[PDB]
Amino acid sequence: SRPLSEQNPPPVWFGEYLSRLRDTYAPELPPPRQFPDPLGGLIRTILSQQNTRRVAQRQWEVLTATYPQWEAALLDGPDGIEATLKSAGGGLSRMKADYIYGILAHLQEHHGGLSLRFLREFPHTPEGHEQARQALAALPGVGHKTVALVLLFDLRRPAMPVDTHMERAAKRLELVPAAWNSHKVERWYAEVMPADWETRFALHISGVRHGRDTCRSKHPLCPQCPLREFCPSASIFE
C-alpha cells in the first residue's frame, strides 16, 4: 500500500531520543556475539527467550559442556537435549528441545552439515543482508524477531531487532501506533534508522534496558525517563 514510515513519520526529536537512550542506558556498548559459528548464536538466542538471563547463561554453559560439537546434540535427539536443558533449571525444556533439534536436523538433511558460517559470506550490500535474512527465515520455527537478533548480534549486519520492552515504550511514546504488531514496529524502525550496524546495535541494547528498567509494563518510571519531556503517556501514569 505505502511504506510504514510514510503512514507514520518519526518525530522531530527522534535523534534526541536515540542520544538520550544511548547516553543513559548504554554509554558503553557490550561486544557483539563472536561465537565460533552463527548456529551457536542462534541457539544462544533461543535459550535466552522467555528465560531469566541467569538460567539462560547456565543452560548455555551446560548445553555446550554436554555437546562440544553441535553434531553431538543432533545424534542425542530432542529427548536428550530436553534432559540437558531441564538439568540446568529451564522451564520450557520440551518445547525448546524440539525447536533446537528441528533446526539441527534441518541443517543436516538440507545442507549436509550443522553450520551457519555461509551466512557470513553474503555481500554486505542491501541485497546480501536480505539474503542472510531470507536464509535465517527458512529455518523451522525461527520468527522475525529471532532473525533480526542473529543478524544484529552474530553477523554484524544492520538489522533492527526491537524487543517487547522497547516496543511497549515506543507505543507509549506514540512513535508508532497501537495497531501495529511486532513485525511492523520492526519494519518502521528499519526504515527510520540509519543503516549503520553500530547505531542499530546501540539502539537495540539501549532500548531494551530503558523499556525493561524504566518503562516497566506495570508502573513505568516516567519521572526518571530521559524521554519524559517527549512522551504523551507520562501524564497518564504520573
Ligand code: SF4
Ligand atoms: S514516559 Fe513513561 S510511558 Fe513514556 S516511554 Fe517513558 S517510561 Fe514509558
Ligand SMILES: [Cl-]
Ligand atoms: Cl558455535
Ligand SMILES: [Cl-]
Ligand atoms: Cl528451557
